Design a protein around this ligand. Structure first.
Ligand code: NA
Length: 131
């Protein structure tokens, strides 16, 4: 079996989707190619980078990307991580499955909020692996 493809989407491919990609590559790596994108590109959020450093994962060289239809077409699961991404997700290929895993936006808050959301994302990906 070829590896499956999971595509994490948030508003700016900045924070939630970047943490999801960082965790995903570690947790899902044996079975999955992991990509992330956004409605816009805001760059990788500095507090998200710091949050991932605390769990020994470097996301500082991950890319902030717009949604790519070729990746959409080849996705086994598209995961929207916020309301903007979910409400503005482009029309998907008819055979491509999408789920919304909503997480709070730590935007503009203390580092603790990034730690909180980081770890909610970690658990969601761990559960997903074992579905
Ligand atoms: Na990306």
């Amino acid at each position: 079996m070829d590896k499956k493809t999971i595509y994490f989407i948030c508003t700016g491919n900045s924070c939630r989707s970047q943490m999801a990609e960082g965790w995903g590559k570690e947790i899902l790596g044996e079975g999955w190619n992991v990509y992330s994108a956004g409605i816009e590109t805001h760059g990788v959020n500095p507090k998200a980078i710091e949050a991932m450093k605390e769990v020994d994962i470097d996301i500082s060289n991950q890319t902030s990307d717009l949604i790519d239809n070729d990746i959409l077409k080849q996705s086994d699961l598209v995961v929207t991580l916020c309301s903007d991404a979910d409400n503005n997700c482009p029309i998907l290929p008819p055979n491509v499955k999408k789920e919304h895993w909503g997480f709070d936006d730590p935007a503009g808050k203390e580092w603790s909020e990034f730690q909180r959301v980081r770890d909610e994302i970690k658990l969601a990906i761990e559960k997903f692996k074992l579905r």
